[PDB]
């Protein structure tokens, strides 16, 4: 399923 | 970058820049995290377990507001603020592999992480909400890149 990491973290 | 690329964007970017994208969902609770995607998966399964009186307990409806600045959720009925998270303090958002209607995002407090767990009023909505969080990460990133010479 869906998973997204935050580049600003 | 590992965020939502442009072909998956659900919204005109203006709706995350000059406004917010607001959804309703069930709130299952927030859990403190020691630390993979194990983290979200583990927390999601635990929070669902906690919410089972078996039958589920009457969990609150929240309004989730997403912009390039971050994420806020408030009680949908009472309107009180449960949490406001600046986008820099948000590491990730993901769907529960076990229940695709359930989704979470993780924030950086202190020095510990919290995983905030929700169940959409539809599986389609879980996709759309995660995609929206993803897009907000990417839009925030793009705005930040262009800010400094």
Swiss-Prot record, chain A:
Location within or outside the cell: Membrane; Synapse
Processing after translation? Phosphorylated by CaM-kinase II. Dephosphorylated upon NMDA receptor activation or SYNGAP1/MPDZ complex disruption. Phosphorylation by PLK2 promotes its activity.
Tissue specificity? Highly expressed in brain; predominantly in the cortex, hippocampus and olfactory bulb. Present in the postsynaptic density of central excitatory synapses.
Q: Where are the transmembrane segments?
A: none
Q: How does it assemble?
A: Isoforms containing the PDZ-binding domain associate with DLG4 and DLG3 to form the PSD protein complex colocalized with GRIN2B at synapses. Interacts with MPDZ, KLHL17, CAMK2A and CAMK2B. Interacts with FAM81A; the interaction facilitates condensate formation via liquid-liquid phase separation.
Share the domain note from the entry.
The PDZ-binding domain interacts with all three PDZ domains of DGL4.
Its job: Major constituent of the PSD essential for postsynaptic signaling. Inhibitory regulator of the Ras-cAMP pathway. Member of the NMDAR signaling complex in excitatory synapses, it may play a role in NMDAR-dependent control of AMPAR potentiation, AMPAR membrane trafficking and synaptic plasticity. Regulates AMPAR-mediated miniature excitatory postsynaptic currents. Exhibits dual GTPase-activating specificity for Ras and Rap. May be involved in certain forms of brain injury, leading to long-term learning and memory deficits.
Q: What is this protein called?
A: Ras/Rap GTPase-activating protein SynGAP
Species of provenance: Rattus norvegicus (Rat)
Q: Which residues of the full protein are shown?
A: 924 to 932 of 1308
